[PDB]
């Protein structure tokens, strides 16, 4: 008999139902987000970090470190091969 008032009732529930769950999921991660490679930490030195940076990095990612390890184990084992036989 009178005029009910829909057009300003969105205060109680934000428009949409499915994207409401994703709103909180995607709005919160943008605060603590790296602008462009912040704190890359590409430089380190712990007597083995240089080897990791030079060979164990994703830029090369080749089979050369495995061959170097094989050569090193051969060099180490030559001495005890002489010692045993």
């Amino acid at each position: 008999v009178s005029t009910l008032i829909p057009p300003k009732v969105v205060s109680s529930k934000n428009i949409g139902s499915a994207p409401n769950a994703k709103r909180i999921a995607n709005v919160v991660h943008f605060y603590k987000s790296l602008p462009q490679g912040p704190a890359p930490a590409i430089k380190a030195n712990t007597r083995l970090a240089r080897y990791k940076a030079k060979y164990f990095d994703g830029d090369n990612a080749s089979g050369k470190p495995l061959w170097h390890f094989a050569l090193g184990i051969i060099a180490f084992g030559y001495s005890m091969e002489y010692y045993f036989h």
Binding site: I5, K8, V9, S11, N14
Partner: protein
């Protein structure tokens, strides 16, 4: 004047003249309509606060 032996035009005219103030305007609603407006104002202001903060976000 077209009617010659009326004997009743005077009566009906007097009745109409006596009943000229047929009734006054009914301006009864002064608070319940105001209640509807204050509810609508509250809804509108909370709505626009929500909208402004959502767009800024």
């Amino acid at each position: 004047s077209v009617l010659k032996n009326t004997s009743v035009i005077d009566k009906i005219e007097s009745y109409v003249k006596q009943y000229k103030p047929v009734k006054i305007d009914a301006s009864k609603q002064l608070q319940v309509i105001e209640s509807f407006e204050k509810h609508a104002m509250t809804n509108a202001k909370e709505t626009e606060s929500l909208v402004s903060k959502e767009l800024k976000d």
